Design a protein around this ligand. Structure first.
Ligand code: 3LW
Lengths: 31, 31, 31, 31
């Protein structure tokens, strides 16, 4: 399980997607 | 196909490049 | 050690997490 | 060469580091 997939890869996607949620919301209210 | 390449890797590039398009445009109009 | 894990992967996580620390702090003071 | 290392990985690092150069400069002048 872990060997077939490392948590680093999952975190990478989460960091990008998660950041977008906050960053998108910031610009969502105003351009 | 999928085994040789996971969608997570592709998404990572898209997230970075995609975000840049929006982030770049924001600063494109003004410094 | 290095072969089992490349520094590029580690740097990637650091770049995302590190950037968040600075970016988060910027928005931390003000929305 | 290419098989041992894909351009996607290299681009990922460049995207993060490159973005930081521009993003850092923006905040460099002002907080
Ligand atoms: Br900057 C930055 C944002 C996201 C980053 C993670 N990218 C990778 C690309 C590929 C190599 C590793 C692990 C997976 C797949 C995610 C790093 S680096």
């Amino acid at each position: 399980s872990n060997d077939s997939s490392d948590p680093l890869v999952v975190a990478a996607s989460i960091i990008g997607i998660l950041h977008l949620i906050l960053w998108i919301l910031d610009r969502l209210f105003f351009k």
